[PDB]
Amino acid sequence: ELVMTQTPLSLPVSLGDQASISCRSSQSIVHSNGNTYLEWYLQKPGQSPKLLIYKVSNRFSGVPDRFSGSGSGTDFTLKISRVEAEDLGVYYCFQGSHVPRTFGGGTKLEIKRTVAAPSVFIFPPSDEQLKSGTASVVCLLNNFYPREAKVQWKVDNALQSGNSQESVTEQDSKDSTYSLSSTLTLSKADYEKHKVYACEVTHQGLSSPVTKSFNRG
Amino acid sequence: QVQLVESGGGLVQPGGSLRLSCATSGFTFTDYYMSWVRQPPGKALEWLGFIRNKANGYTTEYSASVKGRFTISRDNSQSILYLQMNTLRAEDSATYYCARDGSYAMDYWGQGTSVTVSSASTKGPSVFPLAPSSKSTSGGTAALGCLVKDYFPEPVTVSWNSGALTSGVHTFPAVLQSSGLYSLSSVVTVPSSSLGTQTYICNVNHKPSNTKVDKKVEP
Ligand SMILES: O=C(O)CCCCN(Cc1ccc([N+](=O)[O-])cc1)CP(=O)(O)O
């Protein structure tokens, strides 16, 4: 029955600013006898969800005071005054008055910081992996910002496509930057067939596209 | 003090069963309601159901999404929480958590146990080195890592030098190769001056295939 809808789904806040989030229920969540059990949980990258506010404004243990719960009946809001690197992750609201229990859609939170260009590295296929019969070339765009970043492979100045896939890490709780890995996959054969392997990275933080390459195969 | 450790996760054929367990310690197990909550990779949390404390006849409640197909129970003389699942489908694939509920809501959560529903069989990965490219181009700072390739199912653990190495360590999200086998890299950045006095080893561990590998990355 009950439907918990959070908003926004995403939220870009500047280190130090104030953040606000809403959780609207389908019906009053005032547990008949007593009060209203509306909680706020927060999940940080690679961790488990953790309690923040229980009843509605009730702040759990070691939780800073920057967090404050509020609202009643069908409108609740979680506010974080003076946001920072650590508060990164997804926030969720939970209704614990009516069964079945309900979980909010989930509001993500990314931290905006000054522009940082990616540092590029390029690794040729291991010898051990070549014995196998396949070669994996890996390009690394390390600690950059914003998230957007292009990567193109060129085997002998020839552009490539549909033979490589990427993977981006989640914003770092430290410097709030991203990292990306690209892997060019080719058969041991075709790899022997060429000479120059290059990785060309494009980013807002770069004034002129940077390139990393190597001559072997 | 309070400890909630779940297990029993792993790979399972579509249509089969798998019972999960959650070990607790550090509080009066029978005074609390015990909850089960799953989360598919990259998606939102989904309340599954709970079992009330003793004061309420240990009654169970389930989420419409799993009711009748899933069951919860508890061993009080041992303080263990259970979750029996049946006729599992591919979508049931997720990380399952347990938590206790009481005067402070779900104040304590477990670290989770991952589940995968697939007809595909287990497979240990192969680990190759992302060697500090010899002529490490214009840079006093070098990058090196390990390539964990061709494994199934997820997940795979990767630490450096038994955990001691933590600075500038990035483990990327696994991706699916056209072969239906996962793959992922783990990098670390350090000074190029020390590529002769230091040692770097990635300790990769799988589990669904009982695989442990400690590969020492070298220039
Ligand atoms: O009557 C009482 O004192 C118990 C409070 C009623 C709420 N109970 C237990 C209950 C559920 C959730 C919380 N919380 O903090 O989130 C606290 C207590 C729900 P149910 O009747 O078993 O579905």
DSSP B116-171: EE-SSPPB--EEEEE---TT--S-SEEEEEEEEEEEBSS--EEEEGGGTB-TTEEE
CA A77, A81, A85 angle in degrees (round to 5)? 110
Hey, which residues does B216 pair with through a beta bridge? B201
- 33-72 in B: which are within 8 Å (CB) of A? 35, 37, 44-47, 49-50, 61-64
Whole-Å CA distances, B199 to A182, B161, B196, B202, B216? 25, 8, 8, 10, 7
Q: Do B172 and A167 touch (CB under 8 A)?
A: yes
User: Backbone dihedral region of B168: left (phi > 0), alpha (psi from -120 to 50 degrees) or beta?
Assistant: left
Q: Which residues of A touch B46 (CB under 8 A)?
A: 103
Residue to test with chain B: of A40, A48, A107, most B Cβ within 10 A:
A48
- Phi, psi dihedrals of residue B149, rounded to the nearest 5°: -125, 150
Name the structure determination technique. X-ray
What are the boundaries of each domain within chain A?
3-113, 114-216
Q: Do both B127 and B204 map to the same domain?
A: yes
Q: Do both B52 and B20 map to the same domain?
A: yes
- Phi, psi dihedrals of residue A11, rounded to the nearest 5°: -155, 110
| Strands B10-12 and B113-117, bridge-based pairing | parallel
CA A46, A163, B206 angle in degrees (round to 5)? 35
Write out the DSSP string of B45-112: -EEEEEE--GGGTT-EEE-TTTBTTEEEEEETTTTEEEEEE-S--GGG-EEEEEEEEETTEEEEE---
Architecture of domain A114-216 in this structure: Sandwich (2.60)
Q: What does the alpha-carbon distance between residue A49 and residue A54 come to, in Å, rounded to a whole number?
A: 14
Hey, which residues does B48 pair with through a beta bridge? none
Helix, strand or coil, per DSSP, at residue A85: helix
A44 DSSP assignment: -
Domain that holds residue B12: 1-119
Q: Are A15 and A85 in contact (CB under 8 A)?
A: yes
Give the residue from A149, A200, A168, A145 showing the smallest Cα distance to B175. A168
Instruction: Out of A100, A132, A140, name the one closest to residue B143 (CB).
Output: A140
Asked whether the bond before B155 is cis by omega within 30 degrees of 0, the reply is: yes
Q: Do B45 and A49 touch (CB under 8 A)?
A: yes
Q: Mutation test of ligand 1: which of B35, B53, B101 has the most ligand atoms closer than 8 Å to its C-beta?
A: B101
For residue B138, give every residue at least 6 positions away whose Cβ sits within 8 Å of its Cβ, in sequence order, or none: none
Q: Distance from the CA of A4 to the center of ligand 1, in angstroms? A: 19
Q: Do both B136 and B115 map to the same domain?
A: no
Q: What does the alpha-carbon distance between residue B81 and residue B79 come to, in Å, rounded to a whole number?
A: 7
Q: Do both B67 and B143 map to the same domain?
A: no
Asked whether the bond before A146 is cis by omega within 30 degrees of 0, the reply is: yes
What the block records as the tokens of B90 is 């591919």
Whole-Å CA distances, B48 to A7, A13, B26, B32, B76? 23, 32, 24, 17, 21
Nearest residue of B to residue A211, measured between CA atoms: B137
Smallest Cα distance from B112 to chain A, Å? 7
Q: Do both B75 and B63 map to the same domain?
A: yes
List of long-range contacts for B191-200, beta carbons under 8 Å, 24+ apart:
B191/B140, B191/B141, B191/B142, B192/B132, B192/B136, B192/B139, B192/B140, B192/B141, B192/B142, B193/B140, B195/B132, B195/B136, B195/B142, B195/B219, B199/B161, B200/B144, B200/B160, B200/B161, B200/B165
For residue B151, give every residue at least 6 positions away whose Cβ sits within 8 Å of its Cβ, in sequence order, or none: B123, B124, B125, B181, B182, B183, B206, B209, B211
- 115-134 in A: which are within 8 Å (CB) of B? 119, 121-126, 128-129, 132
Last residue in a domain, options B119, B150, B185: B119
Give the residue from A169, A165, A110 showing the smallest Cα distance to A144. A169
Q: Do B147 and A138 touch (CB under 8 A)?
A: yes
Same fold, A3-113 and A114-216: yes
- Phi, psi dihedrals of residue B42, rounded to the nearest 5°: 85, 0
User: Which protein residues are within 6 Å of ligand 1, measured from CB?
Assistant: A 37, 39, 54, 96, 99; B 52, 56, 101, 105
Q: Which residues of B touch A181 (CB under 8 A)?
A: 172, 185, 187
For residue A44, give every residue at least 6 positions away whose Cβ sits within 8 Å of its Cβ, in sequence order, or none: A50, A88, A89, A173
Q: Which residues of B touch A132 (CB under 8 A)?
A: 126
Q: Please count the other Cβ atoms lying within 10 Å of the Cβ belonging to residue B74.
A: 19
Asked whether the bond before B173 is cis by omega within 30 degrees of 0, the reply is: no
Q: Do both B83 and B163 map to the same domain?
A: no
| Residue type for position B99 | A
User: Backbone dihedral region of B70: left (phi > 0), alpha (psi from -120 to 50 degrees) or beta?
Assistant: beta
Question: Which helix H or strand E contains A58, and what residues bound it?
Answer: none
Q: What does the alpha-carbon distance between residue A166 and residue B19 come to, in Å, rounded to a whole number?
A: 35
Q: What does the alpha-carbon distance between residue A197 and residue A136 come to, in Å, rounded to a whole number?
A: 11
Name the closest-CA residue to atom 1, ligand 1. A33
Q: Which residues of A touch B45 (CB under 8 A)?
A: 41, 43, 49, 92, 103, 106
**What CATH number should be reported for the domain holding residue B218?**
2.60.40.10
Q: What does the alpha-carbon distance between residue A18 and residue A25 come to, in Å, rounded to a whole number?
A: 24
Q: Distance from the CA of B214 to the center of ligand 1, in angstroms? A: 48
B179 DSSP assignment: T
Scan for tokens 């390390």, then name that residue: A142
For residue B159, give every residue at least 6 positions away whose Cβ sits within 8 Å of its Cβ, in sequence order, or none: B165, B202, B203
For residue B37, give every residue at least 6 positions away whose Cβ sits within 8 Å of its Cβ, in sequence order, or none: A49, A103, B45, B46, B47, B48, B96, B97, B98, B99
Q: Are B116 and B100 in contact (CB under 8 A)?
A: no
Length of chain B (residues): 219
Cα-Cα-Cα-Cα torsion A160, A162, A163, A168, nearest 10 degrees, comes to 100
For residue A76, give every residue at least 6 positions away whose Cβ sits within 8 Å of its Cβ, in sequence order, or none: A22, A23, A24, A25, A38, A56, A69, A70, A93
Q: Do A37 and B105 touch (CB under 8 A)?
A: yes
Instruction: Out of A99, A122, A165, name the one closest to residue B61 (CB).
Output: A99
Helix, strand or coil, per DSSP, at residue A71: strand
Last residue in a domain, options B119, B139, B158: B119
- 144-173 in B: which are within 8 Å (CB) of A? 145, 147, 149, 170-173
Q: Please count the other Cβ atoms lying within 10 Å of the Cβ belonging to residue B33.
A: 20
Q: Do both B80 and B185 map to the same domain?
A: no
Instruction: Out of B44, B97, B149, name the one closest to residue A48 (CB).
Output: B97
Q: What does the alpha-carbon distance between residue A118 and residue B84 come to, in Å, rounded to a whole number?
A: 47
Q: Do both B10 and B109 map to the same domain?
A: yes
CA A189, A195, A196 angle in degrees (round to 5)? 125
Sheet holding B80-85, edge to edge: B3-7, B18-25, B80-85, B70-75
Asked whether the bond before A209 is cis by omega within 30 degrees of 0, the reply is: no
Q: Are A57 and A70 in contact (CB under 8 A)?
A: yes
Q: What does the alpha-carbon distance between residue B206 and residue B151 come to, in Å, rounded to a whole number?
A: 8
Nearest residue of A to residue B186, measured between CA atoms: A181
Q: Do both B3 and B82 map to the same domain?
A: yes
Q: What does the alpha-carbon distance between residue B117 and residue B153 come to, in Å, rounded to a whole number?
A: 9
Q: Which residues of B touch A122 (CB under 8 A)?
A: 133
In chain B, how many domains are there?
A: 2
- Convert B53-73 to b/e letters by CB count within 10 Å (16 or more is b): beeeebebbbbeebeeebbbe
Question: Which helix H or strand E contains B10, and what residues bound it?
Answer: strand B10-12
Last residue in a domain, options B84, B119, B154: B119
Q: Do both B94 and B162 map to the same domain?
A: no
Chain Cα centroid distance, residue B17: 19
Deposited resolution, Å: 2.8
B94 touches chain A (CB under 8 A): no
Q: What does the alpha-carbon distance between residue A141 and residue A146 come to, in Å, rounded to a whole number?
A: 12
Asked whether the bond before B129 is cis by omega within 30 degrees of 0, the reply is: no
Architecture of domain A3-113 in this structure: Sandwich (2.60)
